[PDB]
Amino acid sequence: STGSATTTPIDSLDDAYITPVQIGTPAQTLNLDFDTGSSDLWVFSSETTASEVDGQTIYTPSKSTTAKLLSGATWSISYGDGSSSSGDVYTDTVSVGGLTVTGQAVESAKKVSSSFTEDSTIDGLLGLAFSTLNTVSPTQQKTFFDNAKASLDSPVFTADLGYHAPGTYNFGFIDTTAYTGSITYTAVSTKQGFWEWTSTGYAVGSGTFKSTSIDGIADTGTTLLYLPATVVSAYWAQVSGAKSSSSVGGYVFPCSATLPSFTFGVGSARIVIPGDYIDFGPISTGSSSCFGGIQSSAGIGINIFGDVALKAAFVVFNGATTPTLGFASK
Numbered sequence: 001s002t003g004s005a006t007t008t009p010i011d012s013l014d015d016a017y018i019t020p021v022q023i024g025t026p027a028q029t030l031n032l033d034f035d036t037g038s039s040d041l042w043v044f045s046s047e048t049t050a051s052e053v054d055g056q057t058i059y060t061p062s063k064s065t066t067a068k069l070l071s072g073a074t075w076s077i078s079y080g081d082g083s084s085s086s087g088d089v090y091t092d093t094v095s096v097g098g099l100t101v102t103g104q105a106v107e108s109a110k111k112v113s114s115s116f117t118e119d120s121t122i123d124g125l126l127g128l129a130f131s132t133l134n135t136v137s138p139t140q141q142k143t144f145f146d147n148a149k150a151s152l153d154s155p156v157f158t159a160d161l162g163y164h165a166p167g168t169y170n171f172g173f174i175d176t177t178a179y180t181g182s183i184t185y186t187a188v189s190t191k192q193g194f195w196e197w198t199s200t201g202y203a204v205g206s207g208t209f210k211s212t213s214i215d216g217i218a219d220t221g222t223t224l225l226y227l228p229a230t231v232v233s234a235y236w237a238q239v240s241g242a243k244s245s246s247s248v249g250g251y252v253f254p255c256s257a258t259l260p261s262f263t264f265g266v267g268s269a270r271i272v273i274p275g276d277y278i279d280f281g282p283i284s285t286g287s288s289s290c291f292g293g294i295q296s297s298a299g300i301g302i303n304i305f306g307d308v309a310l311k312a313a314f315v316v317f318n319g320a321t322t323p324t325l326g327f328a329s330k
């Protein structure tokens with residue numbers, strides 16, 4: 001089997017991407033944030049505290065003839081931005097772009113933090129990291145990809161995120177028309193539960209490539225590119241007036257600037273992020289200070305190849321017995 005679904009930016013900045021997902025019988029379609037940095041499929045639901053729902057579409061398990069309570073199971077998750085959610089668990093039929101999994105754990109939120117309530121466009125998350133990170137207790141649950149894998153034509157999914165435009169998530173096949181050149185594959189460590197890999201270096205604009213190993217994760221659920229402070233300082237030093245602002249929480253730059261590109265290495269190959277992809281717009285409405293798309297990872301504990309980096313590539317998440325990642329230009 002295969003599946004193919006369009007993913008759409010939630011706003012004009014590409015702050016996140018939503019993909020429609022069918023849950024239950026008859027189908028209830030929710031728009032989920034596909035997140036290769038976590039491993040829980042959770043949704044706003046008829047069980048979510050009413051004051052914490054503001055415009056989201058909810059899953060109502062009592063209206064699904066295939067829903068079954070997973071008795072005794074609870075979940076609770078905290079993310080890198082400080083947001084969180086928790087609740088109980090149903091199994092139900094879940095379909096993505098024509099690919100159907102029966103018995104998928106659907107984690108129904110009883111509580112969500114304010115940042116989720118405030119994002120009316122995101123009805124939940126669909127985790128695509130390794131199932132060892134799934135938070136369901138006392139019986140850990142499998143991700144949608146892990147459940148689908150055996151049925152897929154090939155044990156892979158691909159992320160093709162657009163810049164200010166829709167893109168595609170494919171399951172079970174590699175669309176050879178969706179990228180240019182060849183795909184360069186690179187090793188993955190699953191030890192922390194992430195799609196963790198080592199970039200071979202970077203360049204700023206037209207500058208020379210610096211060969212240096214940068215361990216990080218491929219995370220479709222993180223907006224920005226978070227890299228070591230040395231790398232990030234070298235980038236912003238090429239932008240007149242750019243500075244790190246403790247009050248804003250990162251590097252800002254004059255909105256009048258033209259940003260240089262940023263290149264990252266994948267083995268001997270190179271992915272080029274155009275400068276425009278690094279502009280996240282005014283820090284507050286009407287400001288002439290703009291927020292940068294490349295930020296320091298120093299306070300995180302891990303480097304994160306988020307959407308800023310991934311949207312510049314066609315990315316293969318290869319879930320073979322030994323997982324690997326593939327990157328192609330597009």
Ligand SMILES: Cc1ccc(/C=C/N)s1
Pocket residue numbers: 016033035036037038079080081083122125219220221222
């Ligand atoms: C909207 C989102 C908040 C936290 C997420 C997890 C990123 N890996 S996605």
